[PDB]
C-alpha cells in the first residue's frame, strides 16, 4: 500500500524533488562545474525507517521513479549503490512490481500493468547486472542473497517474472566468484524452494491471458529455464536429482510442444505450392521449434544431458 509509505501525493512530491536534484547535478556536470550529490541522496529516503514501506520502494511503483534510476546511479558511489540493492532485496515482497508480475497476486494483469513490468525489467535489472558484474565482492553478493532469503517468502518471489530474474542474477553472479560460504548459502536457498520448484511455471489460464494481450503465439518461458540452469549449475548431484524430479513433467510438456512443431514443419514443407505466406508460416514454426530446443538444452547441458534426435541422452 502507498499509505504505508506516506501516501500518493507525498511519494509523487518526492519523485519531483529527485528529478530537480538530478537536473541540477546534470547541469553542473555539463557546464564542467563541481558536483555535490548529498541533497539528491537525502531526497531518496533510503536510510529512512519512519514508514512500514520505505519511501524509495514506493517511488519504484511509478514509471517516473523507475526511469530516473540510471541517472541516479551516475552520481552515487559504491556503498550508496549497495545500500539501494540491499533495500530492494530486503523489501522485495513489498515492491509493487513483484505483486503485479506474480500470477498468484495478479492472475489477470492489464496491458498497462504488463508495460510497467517490462519497463522495470529493462531499466532496473540492467542496473543491478552492471553493478554486480563490476563493483561487488564475495561478502557483498552473499549479503544480498541472505537479505532475499531471510526477509521474503522465496517461493512467492519465484511466482513473479521479476522475482525469478533477480534470483537468477544473484545465483549466476555468486557462481562466477571463484566447503564454501556459497555452498552453505545455496543450500539455504534450496531449502526454501524444495517441493515448490514446479510453482515457477505459471498456470495455463495466466499464459493465455498474457499471450492474448501481447500477441504472443507461444508463451516465452526462456527466463524459467535460465533460472533452472543457474540453480542446477551451482548444485551438487543430490540437488540436481530433486530439480529434475520436480520439473520432469515440464521437461516432457516442452518436448511434446517441440515434437508437435516438428510434425507441422514436415507436413507444410512437403506441400508443392508454396506462397510467401506459407514460407512465413514455415519460418515461424522452425524459429519456435529451435527456441524450445535451445531453452531446454540451456538447463539440460548444465547437468551433462542433451535433448537431440527426439530423446534426452548423455552429453559427451
Amino acid at each position: 500500500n502507498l499509505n504505508k509509505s506516506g501516501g500518493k501525493k507525498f511519494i509523487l512530491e518526492l519523485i519531483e524533488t529527485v528529478y530537480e536534484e538530478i537536473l541540477d547535478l546534470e547541469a553542473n556536470l555539463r557546464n564542467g562545474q563541481q558536483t555535490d550529490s548529498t541533497a539528491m541522496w537525502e531526497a531518496l529516503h533510503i536510510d529512512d525507517s519512519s514508514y512500514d514501506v520505505n519511501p524509495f520502494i514506493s517511488m519504484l511503483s511509478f514509471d517516473k521513479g523507475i526511469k530516473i534510476m540510471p541517472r541516479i546511479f551516475n552520481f552515487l558511489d559504491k556503498q550508496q549503490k549497495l545500500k539501494i540493492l540491499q533495500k530492494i532485496f530486503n523489501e522485495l515482497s513489498h515492491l509493487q512490481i513483484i505483486i503485479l508480475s506474480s500470477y498468484k497476486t495478479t492472475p489477470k494483469p492489464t496491458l498497462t500493468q504488463l508495460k510497467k513490468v517490462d519497463l522495470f525489467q529493462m531499466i532496473i535489472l540492467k542496473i543491478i547486472v552492471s553493478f554486480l558484474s563490476n563493483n561487488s565482492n564475495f561478502i557483498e553478493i552473499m549479503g544480498l542473497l541472505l537479505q532475499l532469503i531471510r526477509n521474503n517468502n522465496v517461493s512467492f518471489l519465484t511466482t513473479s517474472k521479476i522475482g525469478l530474474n533477480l534470483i537468477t542474477i544473484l545465483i549466476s553472479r555468486a557462481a562466477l566468484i571463484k566447503i564454501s560460504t556459497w555452498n552453505e548459502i545455496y543450500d539455504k536457498l534450496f531449502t526454501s524452494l524444495e517441493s515448490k520448484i514446479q510453482l515457477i511455471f505459471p498456470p495455463r489460464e495466466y499464459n493465455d491471458h498474457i499471450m492474448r494481450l501481447q500477441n504472443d503465439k507461444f508463451m516465452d518461458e526462456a527466463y524459467i529455464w535460465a533460472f533452472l540452469a543457474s540453480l542446477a549449475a551451482s548444485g551438487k548431484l543430490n540437488h540436481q536429482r530433486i530439480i529434475i524430479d520436480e520439473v520432469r513433467d515440464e521437461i516432457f510438456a516442452t518436448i511434446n510442444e517441440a515434437e508437435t512443431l516438428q510434425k507441422k514443419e514436415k507436413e507444410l514443407s512437403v506441400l508443392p505450392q508454396r506462397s510467401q505466406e506459407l514460407d512465413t508460416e514455415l519460418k515461424s514454426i522452425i524459429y519456435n521449434k529451435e527456441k524450445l530446443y535451445q531453452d531446454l538444452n540451456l538447463f539440460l547441458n548444465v547437468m551433462g544431458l542433451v535433448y537431440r534426435d527426439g530423446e534426452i541422452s548423455e552429453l559427451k
Binding site: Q240, I244, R248, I312
Partner: peptide
Amino acid sequence: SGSNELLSILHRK
C-alpha cells in the same frame, strides 16, 4: 556417471 543417475530420475513413472 552423474548424467546416468539424472537420466534414471527422468525414467520415473
